[PDB]
Amino acid sequence: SIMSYNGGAVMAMKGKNCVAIAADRRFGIQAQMVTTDFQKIFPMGDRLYIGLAGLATDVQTVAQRLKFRLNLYELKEGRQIKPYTLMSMVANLLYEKRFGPYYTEPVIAGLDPKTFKPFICSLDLIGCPMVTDDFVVSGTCAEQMYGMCESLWEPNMDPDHLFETISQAMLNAVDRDAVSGMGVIVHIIEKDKITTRTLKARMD
Amino acid sequence: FDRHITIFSPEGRLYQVEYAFKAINQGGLTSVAVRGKDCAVIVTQKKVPDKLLDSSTVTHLFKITENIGCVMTGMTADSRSQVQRARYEAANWKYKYGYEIPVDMLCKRIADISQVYTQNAEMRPLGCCMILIGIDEEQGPQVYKCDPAGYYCGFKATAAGVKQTESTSFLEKKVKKKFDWTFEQTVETAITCLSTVLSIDFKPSEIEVGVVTVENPKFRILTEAEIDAHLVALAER
Amino acid sequence: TTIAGVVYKDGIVLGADTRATEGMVVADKNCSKIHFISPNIYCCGAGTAADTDMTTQLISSNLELHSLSTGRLPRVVTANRMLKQMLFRYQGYIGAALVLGGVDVTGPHLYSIYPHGSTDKLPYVTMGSGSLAAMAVFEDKFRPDMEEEEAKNLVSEAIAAGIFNDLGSGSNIDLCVISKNKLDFLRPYTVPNKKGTRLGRYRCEKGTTAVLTEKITPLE
Amino acid sequence: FSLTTFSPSGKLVQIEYALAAVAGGAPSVGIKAANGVVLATEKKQKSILYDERSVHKVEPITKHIGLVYSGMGPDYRVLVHRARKLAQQYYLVYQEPIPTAQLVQRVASVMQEYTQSGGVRPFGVSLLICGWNEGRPYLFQSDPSGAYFAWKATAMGKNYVNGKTFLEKRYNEDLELEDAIHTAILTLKESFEGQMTEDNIEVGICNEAGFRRLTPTEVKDYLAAIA
Amino acid sequence: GYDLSASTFSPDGRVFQVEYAMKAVENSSTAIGIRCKDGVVFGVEKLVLSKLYEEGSNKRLFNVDRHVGMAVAGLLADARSLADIAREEASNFRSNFGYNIPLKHLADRVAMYVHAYTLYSAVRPFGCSFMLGSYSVNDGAQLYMIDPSGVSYGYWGCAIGKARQAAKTEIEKLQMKEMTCRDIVKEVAKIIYIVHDEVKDKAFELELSWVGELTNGRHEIVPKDIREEAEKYAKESLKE
Amino acid sequence: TTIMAVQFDGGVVLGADSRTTTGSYIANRVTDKLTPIHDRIFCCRSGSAADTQAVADAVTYQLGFHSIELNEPPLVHTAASLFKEMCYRYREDLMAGIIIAGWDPQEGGQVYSVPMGGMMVRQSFAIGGSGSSYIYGYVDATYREGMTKEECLQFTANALALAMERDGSSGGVIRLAAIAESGVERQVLLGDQIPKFAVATL
Question: What is the residue range of A68's domain?
Fold first, then answer.
């Protein structure tokens, strides 16, 4: 397949007045690992992040071309961006290539910078958004992560438990996908602090 | 100087656009339009100087659609162009949107076209006025006029041509009394206005009358045998 | 996917499911397949979701631009003629199959539009993957000049037939009722499927996850 | 004469003359209360024949943005269309209704497109753009030059100086949308050369519910010095 | 001044270039056309400036289609061009709709091409008026004239050029609505010989063309045996 | 699809089934394959619905503009020629079989078939679609010159009934239409009104 040429895995999960996002740290060609500190989560503001799994060329291209538009936006505008609007910006950016598509399936997670209610979204490679209220996944291990988040997720979760949930899903999912792993990184973002952790994961 | 090309003057005025209102009076004819409760009528005079012309070709009334009719006043060649553009726009409206164009919208489309000629120095404006008529679904009969500058408005009655002030005085004097408007009263009012301002004692050959009604919304240009019926009734009372 | 429509004595009733798949796997559960076109015109969409979203959005903007110049209420023929003229221009590469319905001065109209630019105006239309199950109900139970609640029951039965007999449909039934003097967008209308209550608990306590690196970054 | 030409003093003369066409149009009032914005103007006809229910000096751009002008109506109908398109472009990209300031910027860009080429004259209109975004009212004033100004209250057109001093002496905050309409009509009554009827003016307001052009009944209500 | 461009108005709404383009038609030789009961007949006062020119040079009667003819007065290059446009109009009409173009429609399509030159600064107006003439079993006989401004009207008889007044004053005497083409030929030649002035300009040639029943909707140059039989009548009616 | 057209002295008769298939599923069983291009000019539509609908709309635009700017009623040959130019200029992109039937003062009732490749030819009776193969013999053995309006309606109904009985992609309802100087009459046959023929039992 196409997106399995580089691999990847991204997850997002909400709490009560908080949200999380996680990704694996591997870069490799078809079956060979090249690098173990590859970036797949990109900040798009304070209390707002985006994650990208797919073809690495398209990951970097989409991130750079989106930061372009975001910087011009918040310069013309006098305000930081809402997540609902970043979702539509990405949808437009991807649907402009409806027949030349970027091979990415982004995942967004953030807090509105006035009322700080959490937000999580998912998009396809041509920009159909998907605003769930429990969790979203994208990558090569999507079924394996659906199976974990369906069983472990609970409605109201403080950050100490949300971290455990989004970590125990990612670890046990990427431990059954051959082209995803070699580390897992997690971001927890609240009104007052953004916490960031790398986890003890298998490197096989 | 501030009168040759479409630039602004120190007092904020466009003189080449005012001079296109003066070309309307070069044809030497006057048009009148009147609105009723169930009808809308347009009237103009039909002046052939030669007996060698075919009177069938000498007209200023035009069919834009089956339900919209026009009378054009001013330079004769400009009017045919504006009429063909009106027809093209009416046809493409229905091709695109699936229903017949109103008069309210066709008028402002022509006005939008005319305003570009005032804002761009490519082409000259057209020395022609235009009065349209048509029956609307909810609004009823409509009378609309547009200018060389891109101004448009709806009217109860109006005129276009040389005898336009002395026609709009007659009309505003008759409109205030607010009688029971009818087909016959409407046509009589129009013919009496055109007779008073010209003082000519019309024949059926010297005018052409187009009408549109709520009963029959199809625009139809009248015959000499049907204008005589309204002309005879005038001499009575 | 499963979408349907009917024309009853006073107006229009539309219906749709909420499931969205990417393969043989369920991605969304509470999708919204009934789209705004105008305060009197709504549309249901099957096929490639992004195509339907962008198409409906574009025609919505163009009608909000047309109605604002005219100052009148839009018509359904206008939306139909826009949609079909675009989809015919793309020769089917836009996978937008639609069920469009509204109420204007001429009365209630309902259309089905296919991605190559063909159109059918009918008193009842179905579309999606559960089309055949829905129409199996419409052919057996439809009547002209029905009431509002009869029509709503019929459409709910059709969407439920598409749900419980097709694999690509499920998880809810939405409706939209349109009339000359009212509009009622019902999201959700019925919930025929509910996940099972879980017996055990797997809440992970602080410490079960091992960490190598930590960072904090205060904000205000 | 030419527009791509400076004077030795450093002035653009055709722009100054396009503003003279704004300074001779019908008056237009603008007031920004605490919970709304008012737009009022003189809509007077040259005869009893003109049907006043067919053309409008107060027009909506969106549910929450509206316009008036002073000057040329043909020029106004172009900018109305352009603003209505730009709002829809913004919505199509971001799926959020356009803020009132971004529309003013993008419309002044259109007005500036017509100031730099030869073979084009500028617009003979100034605009007043009312809005309600982020729980706050807004009022701007776009000019043919491509320049905009945010106002708390102002007046354009004939007698735009005395009509503005009247506001300086008869306007404050801690108002609401109903005390401001009375002040706007009083500011129009200065220049009204005749009896003010419900059909000789045209009013539009914006608030939390959005923009609305009032009806002749509502105009006749407050025309009695009521509210 | 106010009289140097066709994009310019005067303070009384006049465009003087379009009038100056008619002044050029007034200074050209005279052509007439008369609509009969069963056809149309064209006649032209063709001036021979030099004896070195062949008999047949500067033809001012043109075939625009196999049922339409054209007579011109003014600048001749402009007329040849407008003939070339009137030909491609009728060509594309048959190519798109599949039948012969009517003359009321061809007249409009050429009138608009002519009117387009009255609006711009980069072009002048055309310096030629011209008549078109056709015959069909359904549409009947038809005669339209088109001016530089872009105006187009139908006619029973018409003239263009120097002796316009003198020629229509003779054409109104005719009861053309009663007559056939072979009888109106005599009248056409008689008028051209009446209005021609031998002292104002040198010898001339008579040029005639037809369309009607007797040609079966085919625009033709008149044969020689009839043109001479009419030129003779013209001479014998000059005893007046 | 099964379309059919016949001319008599005064005018023409048209006919069509009501089925629109997507493979073997019947998407629309009450389709209207007759289409007014003008007041007295009709189209019987076969082939891809998208392509033919678009061509019909475009030709309606063209003929309306043409007829208004002429101010006389258009010919049937004119509409047929516009159909021909569109179907031939885009023959590599359209699957469109057309029959044009109507009335004109000059030549009266006329029938023009425009098959896929975009050739045009006038006919006395024209049949088109997928069911015409099953009635090419019946219409040849039953046609007779000198038929009136009612006999032509009968002929056109009997043929379409057979074509619908045998063709799987044809059925439902026979939509007729007669055109003449007086106007345009339209019938709808359904149920027992559709002609029945003996089906053998031995």
Answer: 1-204
